[PDB]
Amino acid sequence: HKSSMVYIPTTKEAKRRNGGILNTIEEVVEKLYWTYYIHLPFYLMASFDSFFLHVFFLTIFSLSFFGI
Amino acid sequence: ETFEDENDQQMLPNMAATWVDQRGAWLIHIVVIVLLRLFYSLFGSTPKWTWTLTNMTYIIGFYIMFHLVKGTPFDFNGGAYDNLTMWEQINDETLYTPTRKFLLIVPIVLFLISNQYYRNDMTLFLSNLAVTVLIGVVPKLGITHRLRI
Amino acid sequence: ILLTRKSYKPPKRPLTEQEIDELCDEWVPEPLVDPSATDEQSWRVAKTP
């Protein structure tokens, strides 16, 4: 019972079709970036406020590290 | 207000003054305070300046949010609240509820904690006590309800 | 002192002249006596020696 629907494979399947540890490092970096990005309201700011808030947080972390 | 206005007000829960009773609505006022301390300390000045800045900014922000704007930020029925601030709409105009008690207690404890550091300066001590008393508890009394100057 | 209050509600504004007048004109009292059952009971009066 075939229909006119085009299916899209899960990312796991895409990697399996496309086949050491450096990629694992890159993906955990991506994971961390995803957490940081989604738990803050970046999807609702055009570009300027988002850029400004990024600089803001980066400055906070830099100053905290320098002090401690 | 008259019968129709009260019916419009009572016909629907006020979405702009009901979240204050939900989960986490109390710990947020304490959490926004601990962040101001870590930011004004990051400025890098002497303790008394950091503490007075913290107390001042919290009180001013709280006032400008809960006391300055009148009405609902969206359409209610025909507005039905076109001349009431957010503080007066808490708990459908019932005074001295636990929420109102907590929001009264917060600035006093803020001053008590901050006092120990800038206590040795008369000007800072006077300014902080003046701003606390005159921009905190006073608008939140039961005698200043619906009082326009 | 603040922590020891009772959590009341603001007092309702009282009525005024015209409200009272229209309410009073809206009120209707019953008659002194009840004239409904008088006629089917007056045989007592009519049959007294």
Curated annotation (Swiss-Prot), chain A:
User: What is the protein's major site of localization?
Assistant: endoplasmic reticulum
Q: Which UniProt keywords apply?
A: Endoplasmic reticulum, Lipid metabolism, Membrane, Sphingolipid metabolism, Transmembrane, Transmembrane helix
| GO cellular component terms, A-Z | endoplasmic reticulum; endoplasmic reticulum membrane; serine palmitoyltransferase complex
Compartment annotation: Endoplasmic reticulum membrane
> GO molecular function terms here?
enzyme activator activity
| Domain of life assignment | Eukaryota
A biological process term (GO) from this entry: 3-keto-sphinganine metabolic process
Keyword Transmembrane helix assigned to the entry: answer is yes
Q: How does the record say this protein sits in the membrane?
A: Single-pass membrane protein
Phenotype of null mutants: Lowers the level of total sphingolipids and increases the phosphorylation of YPK1 in the ORM1 and ORM2 double knockout background mutant.
Question: Per the UniProt record, which residue ranges are transmembrane?
Answer: 48-68
- Explain the purpose of this protein: Stimulates the activity of serine palmitoyltransferase (SPT), and thus plays a role in the biosynthesis of sphingolipids.
Q: How does it assemble?
A: Interacts with the serine palmitoyltransferase complex LCB1-LCB2. Component of the SPOTS complex, at least composed of LCB1/2 (LCB1 and/or LCB2), ORM1/2 (ORM1 and/or ORM2), SAC1 and TSC3.
Indicate what this protein is called per its UniProt record.
Serine palmitoyltransferase-regulating protein TSC3
Organism encoding this protein:
Saccharomyces cerevisiae (strain ATCC 204508 / S288c)
UniProtKB/Swiss-Prot annotation, chain B:
Record's bilayer topology term: Multi-pass membrane protein
> Entire protein: which part is shown?
56 to 204 of 216
User: Remarks, anything else?
Assistant: Present with 5240 molecules/cell in log phase SD medium.
UniProt keyword ATP-binding present: no
Name the phenotypic consequences of knocking out this gene: Double knockout of ORM1 and ORM2 exhibits defect in ceramide synthesis, increasing the level of total sphingolipids and causing phytosphingosine and dihydrosphingosine to accumulate; the accumulation of phytosphingosine reduces the phosphorylation of both YPK1 and LAC1. The mutant also exhibits random distribution of actin patches between mother and daughter cells, and shows a defect in endocytosis.
Q: How does it assemble?
A: Component of the SPOTS complex, at least composed of LCB1/2 (LCB1 and/or LCB2), ORM1/2 (ORM1 and/or ORM2), SAC1 and TSC3.
This protein's species is: Saccharomyces cerevisiae (strain ATCC 204508 / S288c)
Show which residues sit on the Cytoplasmic side of the membrane.
70-93
Q: What does this protein do?
A: Component of the SPOTS complex that acts as a negative regulator of sphingolipid synthesis. Acts by inhibiting serine palmitoyltransferases (LCB1 and LCB2) activity. Along with ORM1, plays a role in the phosphorylation of LAC1 and YPK1, the distribution of actin patches between mother and daughter cells, and in endocytosis.
Query: Into which family does the record put it?
Result: Belongs to the ORM family.
UniProt keyword Lipid metabolism present? yes
Q: Where in the cell is it found?
A: Endoplasmic reticulum membrane
PTM description: Phosphorylated in case of disruption of sphingolipid synthesis. Phosphorylation regulates the inhibitory activity of serine palmitoyltransferases (LCB1 and LCB2).
Q: What is this protein called?
A: Protein ORM2
GO biological process, alphabetically ordered? ceramide metabolic process; intracellular sphingolipid homeostasis; negative regulation of sphingolipid biosynthetic process; response to unfolded protein; sphingolipid biosynthetic process
Q: Which residues cross the membrane?
A: 24-44, 49-69, 94-114, 123-143
Write out the topological domains of type Extracellular.
Answer: 45-48, 115-122
Q: Which GO terms describe its molecular function?
A: identical protein binding
One GO location term (cellular component): endoplasmic reticulum
Keywords assigned:
Endocytosis, Endoplasmic reticulum, Lipid metabolism, Membrane, Phosphoprotein, Sphingolipid metabolism, Transmembrane, Transmembrane helix
From Swiss-Prot, chain C:
Enumerate the subcellular locations listed in this protein's record, separating them with semicolons: Endoplasmic reticulum membrane
Going by the entry's taxonomy, the superkingdom of the source organism is recorded as Eukaryota
Q: Phenotype of the disruptant?
A: Defective Embryo and pollen lethality. RNAi mutants display plant size reduction, altered leaf morphology and increases in relative amounts of saturated sphingolipid long-chain bases.
Identify the tissues in which this protein is expressed. Answer: Ubiquitous.
Q: How does it assemble?
A: Heterodimer with LCB2 (LCB2a or LCB2b). Component of the serine palmitoyltransferase (SPT) complex, composed of LCB1 and LCB2 (LCB2a or LCB2b).
Note on file? The fbr11-1 mutant is incapable of initiating programmed cell death (PCD) after induction by fumonisin B1 (FB1), a specific inhibitor of ceramide synthase.
Q: Which family does it belong to?
A: Belongs to the class-II pyridoxal-phosphate-dependent aminotransferase family.
Its annotated function is as follows: Component of serine palmitoyltransferase (SPT), which catalyzes the committed step in the synthesis of sphingolipids, the condensation of serine with palmitoyl CoA to form the long chain base 3-ketosphinganine. The heterodimer formed with LCB2 constitutes the catalytic core. Involved in the regulation of the programmed cell death (PCD) signaling pathway. Plays an important role during male gametogenesis and embryogenesis.
Q: What is this protein called in UniProt? A: Long chain base biosynthesis protein 1
Q: Which organism is it from?
A: Arabidopsis thaliana
